[PDB]
Design a binder for these strands. Structure first.
Lengths: 98, 100, 79, 150, 113
RNA sequence: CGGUCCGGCCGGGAACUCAAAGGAGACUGCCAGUGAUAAACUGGAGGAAGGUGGGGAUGACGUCAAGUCAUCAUGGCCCUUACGACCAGGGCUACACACGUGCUACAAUGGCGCAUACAAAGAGAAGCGACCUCGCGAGAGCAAGCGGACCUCAUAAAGUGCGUCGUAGUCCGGAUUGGAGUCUGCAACUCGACUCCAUGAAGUCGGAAUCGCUAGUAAUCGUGGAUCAGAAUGCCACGGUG
């Protein structure tokens, strides 16, 4: 009866990790929906370009935080069991909740 | 910056999770609200704040690589003295040159 | 400042309550406490308070009931 | 440089249908608070309504008709020397010159409300009766009389 | 008629020459004006003999001027006798506002001609 | 357009917005003119847009062999019973005087009190905190909603409008000085913030002389975050008026 989450920073890894979860969730459930989105976020920051003084010279860094609710059609006991051992590479973050 | 600065957090940061971030929310066990102008708790609470160095205060992250306190930025994961050399090596995930 | 009826003493003074109004026949008691407060009754206790190099002879009235020990122990001299 | 304006366009006053009354609030306003200048325009015209012999719809234009010069004197460098020369006052400035002098006068004044400080200058701006007030125009009277070298 | 003001300007609202001066404050000194029949919005002239008896009734409730300055001055002169940090800083011309005499002590120093 | 947790909630749609991607379109293409008649320019039509469409990213050779072994290493030197580091107390915000820059005002194209119209971008469960109560008040004490896209932080403020006021160092201001407290914390005395009854000064262009850019630019008012046990007016960002 559970619900799922996927969170990342890479614009392609978010889909490659989706394509791991919705397949692990389909291997024990025949009815399909495909992935649902939201929420996406962005963030930018500045730093001094050199380690000693040089405080007028700076460089621009940014990130884009990607998240999917994904949705699972049958969250059945046999299907959540496959998600207790979810691997799925490093570089993303997930949840299982009720 | 000194080699002594690298382990200075070890006891401080541990008591931050243990007591220094909930002891005021749980204070009703070392307090009274029924007796007017009467103390039976101050000397046992001052005994709890008797130890030093480990405080709710005094707490600094530092650059664990050098001991340098200044120029720390949590959004970068690393203090700015080492950021360009680490980020151009590709060591910090996912920092890159892309500019504005 | 800030506190009604003034604060309670430090624990390192709570262990020294036998020398609160009398120092004895000995030299005035050398005190590095400057952040701690005076006893609400303390006259006849002879003390010498630290200034960062030496200890200075301080003067206290029977009417002084709450002051930090540094607040009446000077540190500077002009030029 | 060369590849520059000219004059950028401005939208005429929505109530009067005039581009002079649009430039007027743009130079009158301060700190970009044009909403207060929209309460000073026409509110400063209270004592001019019956007094205007061109009727109310020209009671401000009359103060701009008072002065419409063709040249102004400027002092310009030719080398180790600096001389007075006449420069042309074009149709685009010919109608906006006195408008710029009246707002300076009102801003330099300090009695009553701004809608009354503005009315003090506007009352004499086509009469010119005050003492040492036509010194204002010596920069064009010295230009219609320029001799220079040829 | 006046009750607490001493300055020359006439026909103003019943607060400027009634409150916030020498010791009378503004917190209880204005509530009494309605009992005297005096309004606190817009300039007024209803304070005369008769109305003022409702204000001359307030006795032993407050202190003003030199006796209020005596209260603070003695409350500092008791400390100027002692080796206290603010004792010498009120026996000598020194700041107590936590100042930097390298940059700004201008109120305590003066001109700056 | 039916049904109705009265709700885009379900049926209906995939379009607009809002957030995201990939293309196509602008090429001197087109006319006449100019140009050692050539490169390319000068106007007009047509177009959302015209001439690298517009805007960004990018530092050739050379510049003082710059500032720094105070982030680092790393060759050498000096100290090593210390110039090393662990506590504790004073100091790095001494001052009869100089330099270096901002912000808020000196007001009425302005303030104040009471209404009134409209946000962008961020923050947050040992949290963001809606309320009510005690009280003079900070706040304490309990606590709705919410797991952070149908909640909280949050009446955006300036502006608009009404009431009110002057050339008075002012209705104002409340800078300063004690006394009370409120918070966080061995600890705020000294160097912290918030509050209240009281008191009370400065500012009405401002030295010789000089500073800076071409439009959403200058000018000007609010909102957010970082640091953080506990404070900014500085640091990084957001939108309104223009």
């Amino acid at each position: 009866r559970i619900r799922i989450r996927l969170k990342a920073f890479d614009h392609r890894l978010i889909d490659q990790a989706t394509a791991e979860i919705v397949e692990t969730a389909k291997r024990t459930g025949a009815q399909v929906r495909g992935p649902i989105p939201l929420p996406t976020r962005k963030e930018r920051f500045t730093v001094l370009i050199s380690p000693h003084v040089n405080k007028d010279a700076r460089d621009q860094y940014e990130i884009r935080t990607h998240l999917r609710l994904v949705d699972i059609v049958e969250p059945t006991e046999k299907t959540v069991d496959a998600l207790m051992r979810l691997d799925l590479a490093a570089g993303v973050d997930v949840q299982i909740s009720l | 910056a000194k080699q002594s600065m690298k382990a200075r957090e070890v006891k401080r940061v541990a008591l931050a999770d243990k007591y220094f971030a909930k002891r005021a929310e749980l204070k009703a066990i070392i307090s009274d609200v029924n007796a007017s102008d009467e103390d039976r708790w101050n000397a046992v609470l001052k005994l709890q704040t008797l130890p030093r160095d480990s405080s709710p205060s005094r707490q600094r992250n530092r650059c664990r690589q050098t001991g340098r306190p200044h120029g720390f930025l949590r959004k970068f994961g690393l203090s700015r003295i080492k950021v360009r050399e680490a980020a151009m090596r590709g060591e910090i995930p996912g920092l890159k040159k892309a500019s504005w | 400042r800030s506190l009604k009826k003034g604060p309670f003493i430090d624990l390192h003074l709570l262990k020294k309550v036998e020398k609160a109004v009398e120092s004895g026949d000995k030299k005035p008691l050398r005190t590095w406490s400057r952040r701690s407060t005076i006893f609400p009754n303390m006259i006849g206790l002879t003390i010498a308070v630290h200034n960062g190099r030496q200890h200075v002879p301080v003067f206290v009235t029977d009417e002084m009931v709450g002051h930090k020990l540094g607040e009446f122990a000077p540190t500077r001299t002009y030029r | 440089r060369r590849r520059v304006i000219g004059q950028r366009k401005i939208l005429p006053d929505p109530k009067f249908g005039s581009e002079l009354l649009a430039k007027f609030v743009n130079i009158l306003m301060v700190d970009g608070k044009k909403s207060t200048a929209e309460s000073i325009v026409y509110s400063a015209l209270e004592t001019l309504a019956q007094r205007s012999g061109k009727s109310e719809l020209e009671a401000f234009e009359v103060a701009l008709e008072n002065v419409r010069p063709t040249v102004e004197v400027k002092s310009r460098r030719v080398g180790g020397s600096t001389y007075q020369v006449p420069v042309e006052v074009r149709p685009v400035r010919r109608n906006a010159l006195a408008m710029r002098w009246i707002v300076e006068a009102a801003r330099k004044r300090g009695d009553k409300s701004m809608a009354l400080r503005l009315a003090n200058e506007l009352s004499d701006a086509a009469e010119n009766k005050g003492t040492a007030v036509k010194k204002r125009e010596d920069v064009h009277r010295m230009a219609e009389a320029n001799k220079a070298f040829a | 008629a006046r009750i607490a003001g001493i300055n020359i300007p006439d026909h103003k609202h019943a607060v400027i020459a009634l409150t916030s001066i020498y010791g009378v404050g503004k917190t209880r000194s204005k509530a009494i004006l309605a009992a005297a029949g005096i309004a606190e919005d817009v300039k007024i002239s209803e304070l005369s003999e008769g109305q003022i008896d409702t204000l001359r009734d307030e006795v032993a409730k407050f202190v003003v001027e030199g006796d209020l300055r005596r209260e603070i001055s003695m409350s500092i002169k008791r400390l100027m006798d002692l080796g206290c940090y603010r004792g010498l800083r009120h026996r000598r011309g020194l700041p107590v506002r936590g100042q930097r005499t390298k940059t700004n002590a201008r109120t305590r120093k003066g001109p700056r001609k």
